[PDB]
């Protein structure tokens, strides 16, 4: 038996909300249900056709049992749908799509949903099990402990990024310029209505209060260009370059894609949006995560036999402005082709979701026949990358 | 390309420690490193041959960033090794093996490590982010909140088991007899030396203390048969059937398998233990998880045209004695062929590890040519199953 | 019969009372204490160095740091040579502090003292027991509830104890709601008439990179809706209840301080005293019956001095609940127009450690020359303190 | 003119044994220890419980003890519901300050019989979490023993680190401190084996369901020492040139003490034999870091007030908060060391902080010979001290 061709038939997401902001009352799983239900509606298929689901989700503590199952059932999918929650840190939402593609390729399923979800607003604090130490204890923040601290270096991802800024000589000003570029591209894309088929509105209902309709990304509107160059370099007191403005923020959101075999799409009279061509994972020293996406992207190109020039648009996840700039520089790519409609620095970074968002964005933004390449670094020194072609 | 055949080359585990017991000082990821290093040693290959790693791990809160990456780097595997942490609740350890097999089948990697790890001793308590409510703050136990509570029904796994005991007419005395049988078989297998190849010893080292070598599963010795029928039914005080003795326990442990394509096994000239024949996931109504493994096992049998009678050895994970009895009753299989060397009720149940342990046990215990079938229920109403044939 | 030094009040100052998590909530109890103590010494027109010792009531001390009264005193800029003691008689603390200070003065053991009370209920923490966390989790308890508001013996809230007295004395919901509205009315009128001009000192709340807030009046009395009062549900007892969130006192932040001295010291220091402290007493009853303890304490003071209830121009009976005040009016058979005339805790709020000091200070300012004032305050556990003063 | 005051006498002084931290009495809350000592004292006094008019108890760490700690102790000892109660906090001086303030009420003729003492269960002191929004990056759970009991607010350092400052200034070395400490343990054991606390201390039965009853009848802390280890121990409060150690400092402990106090007139009316007369007392305060010297000034104040000389004092109880403190006091007052802390103190017996001030007064009451003067003094966090002079009757 030969490997089956895999197609993206729909790709949908919630808006991204700011930390403790517009979507902070919704658990990650509920955002997941919203995205999954939206993606299935858009695919125009009976929901019973979806055979199995994988969702990325990095910070699972306190979400209750089986987060992906919660998202799936909450979306109204059948109780017969098996569910697995995926954690490759920042790459989780992309790795979910990759693993689901592998199942489809094997003929183990013909239709799946894959994506990612995160509610950083609802990530809790932890207290160790045991006896309390004389003198007190600090209950640790799981965003910091599980999401953002490199285990081996015992420093923030932001501090790890400083290493790359040093080695590649990427200055504060260049990072700030990228960050401003991202906010500008985000606003322009929202104003041009570019997320109209991608984002679905979320109604937040509180008892006794009026409904709030969240219809666009919250983060990009919280910028002051005049203040960008004034911020302190918080991850390194001496010779620092990374700031709160030129790094991604803490956010809430979910994205989901409907994936099928080519045969399943034919059977169901569905016109797919894009073909999944290839994907790869790469890993380097934990401190050097910003550069892993370079290797992952090169693997994919070399596997398919494409040149970098053959890629119409790049989605290189904006964990930090530093990451994108390292990637542009090492790969020598046209910066007008990279994160064209904004990215994590200005739209925000719900870590388990972003890897799925960037792939769904390519699916909508590419023109017929064009190749898009999405890549995303992750805590621990990893990256995932994926090549798709618009149909 | 054509789908590649997958073989199990090695299968190794730590002993299983009791809650707050012999292994409680070691993090899940450390147990992971131990199992991973041991499986590579038993496989007789350079660590550098391992291309990618998947580990099941249900309760990831407070383990630090990227648990699987920590296990892999802590075992001395190359920094180039991509890692993904898998959460299908209790089925996590088996699902990791299944997904790794799918990547190998696709020709996306040729050698992987897959397994599961859990340190329930070290799972923390959580406090919600936000304002402290007037009148008190609740610190929830992640074991209870994420591990053991069904989301939809708002009851413990043990109460879901009671539901199945009612519907299938499985009485307290029947569950108690099964549990006693499990304890008996575990002790017999340990005394017969049946885990000599499967289990590797763990050395627990404490500053200014003598070393402690943990060489055997701890839990099976923790029973009093005379008290078994006198114990209170903790999940249902009136007309109950499930007890602390006839349920599985909370435990610490890790297991890891080295998987290869048939081509890689030949290239490297290793002696494969077993071929992976088929695997499947099924899901039912959440409260009914005890029966999900029946459907999952039936799926794998049907997939490859085998009948229940063709199976020499069944590993039906003993989440509760109730579960195994429900499976035997529905499948109508010979109890003498089920969990022959004990299982989770007497050996313990580190949830993210168990699905891998039972596959690994089949790999060592099956005789040449024999088929073994492993199935494992999971929170949310799911199950995974795998069929292997001993080489 | 002992011959004792005559004790006088030379000043009585307080911060405004802030609402729970409200205007004064960024300020620790000890800081509010410093503000009131400094204000009191300022109004007394004496050197800080003249204050020899300080006692401050403070019910909920957990997490405030070592020696709360010492913090308040040194925080006001008083000499490092000033001995300090923090007093806890629950809700009576602010009064008991004045009483115990008076006793020292009477003995000739000191000639000038500061006495009062402080509480920041906004900043009262939660606790977790020492030891090993039980499998399955734990509820960290709220100290306001555990130490402040729960009767140990009956294992119920103060408000539920009050329901007991409402039953026994036939003090219905409507009468209590009427008393409540009356307190809010009187509080507003007094504030609008400028009746706290010399008693209250404003506090400036400063937050880096924010405008300053000058808190110059009590925050709580403006937080009522008279239309909602009779519609509120009875929180401490659903079945046949009378006590509500509106007719009970609230959780609050504030501090009060008095300069006390011997009559001799006042003369030496050429300051004119406001009032003479005549007598005071403590009484106790069954813990559940705390609302009636102030009746017995007041009667003890009258009997001791040989006065009649009719001789008192002005009564301050702490408004812990509207019920408590009505229960006192009923049993004592006194004229309601002479009781809590410029409002009280039901509308002004109840920072538990300070209220007993506040009400003595208010009598001091409001009484006319030669008039007698009687202040009484119930406390958790079944107790009450009372004090008789005479204006000079 | 000086007021004419009632004479105040100590009629009984009774305490629980002192338990080590998380040791023998750690299952009992402070208030129950309070009840045990209060009932003890009244029984020993030989009066009806209804004769006690009012109660003051010292108690420094009141968090989580429930409403009105003193009221709990009092009602728990079976005293009438008519008995008013006040909980006193002058940190380490609380147990003595309670007796002092009760004495003032008696002097004024405001009461004729009172119970005064102190109680502390440091084993049961909880941790705290602040009310409000959980701050990004972590939430601290503070130990109230550290935060409220042992940390100087102003200097933001442990009491033992403040103690180092005086060791420095007065040149009191490690070995002298250690010498004192061993001296305390020695006196403690001697006194206990001689049966010297036969009337002072009452035994406590600890009942755990399923378990055999435990009878705690002697102080726990003094047996927990190794004299050979003493000189070896690390100086835990200061990195450079330290002198204070876990062994020459007092420990965290649990205990209560209560005294029955009355006017001379009430003792006659009740036909009881008074034990001692309360002569004078004082409080002093210095710079917060300098709390080890504050008892010097407090004692001097008392002697000066009564016109006595240091040489007139038969027996000194200078609370052994730290070995350093007793030494500083001996040095500055120039008194006979053989007259100081004769039967042990807080370094060997332990230091339940709200209790110790009452314990040491109770101890002079039992130890002094007819007509002798005893002086008890006690430092407290914040830079204070209380002192009391008594004469045996
Ligand atoms: Cl990785
Ligand atoms: Cl599932
Ligand atoms: Cl009382
Ligand atoms: Cl002081």
Verbal overview:
The structure is a homotetramer. The two termini of chain A are 25 Å apart. Chain A is globular and about 60 Å long. In chain A, strands 1, 2, 3, 4, 5, 12, 13, 14, 15 and 16 form a ten-stranded mixed β-sheet that branches. A two-stranded antiparallel ribbon of chain A has the order 6-7. Chain A has 391 residues and is α+β, with helices and mostly antiparallel strands. Chain A is built from eleven helices and 16 strands. In chain A, strand 15 and strand 16 form a beta hairpin. Chain A folds into two domains: 1-125 and 194-276, Thiolase/Chalcone synthase (Peroxisomal Thiolase, Chain A, domain 1, 3-Layer(aba) Sandwich); 152-193 and 277-388, Thiolase/Chalcone synthase (Peroxisomal Thiolase, Chain A, domain 1), CATH 3.40.47.10. Chain A has helices at residues 28-43, 67-74, 92-105, 142-148, 157-168, 172-191, 262-267, 292-304, 321-331, 344-347, 351-365, and strands at residues 6-13, 17-18, 52-56, 83-87, 111-119, 125-127, 137-141, 149-150, 155-156, 202-204, 212-214, 251-261, 274-283, 311-316, 371-378, 382-390. In chain A, helix 1 (28-43) crosses helix 2 and helix 6 (172-191) crosses helix 9. At the C-D interface, helix 2, strand 4, helix 3, strand 6 and helix 4 of C face helix 2, strand 4, helix 3, strand 6 and helix 4 of D. Strand 6 of chain C pairs antiparallel with strand 6 (127-129) of chain D. The structure holds chloride ion (4 copies). The PDB classes it as transferase. The entry lists the keywords thiolase fold, beta-alpha-beta-alpha-beta-alpha-beta-beta topology, alpha-beta-alpha-beta-alpha layered structure. It forms a tetrameric assembly. Crystallographic and kinetic studies of human mitochondrial acetoacetyl-CoA thiolase (T2): the importance of potassium and chloride for its structure and function. Chains A, B, C, D: Acetyl-CoA acetyltransferase.
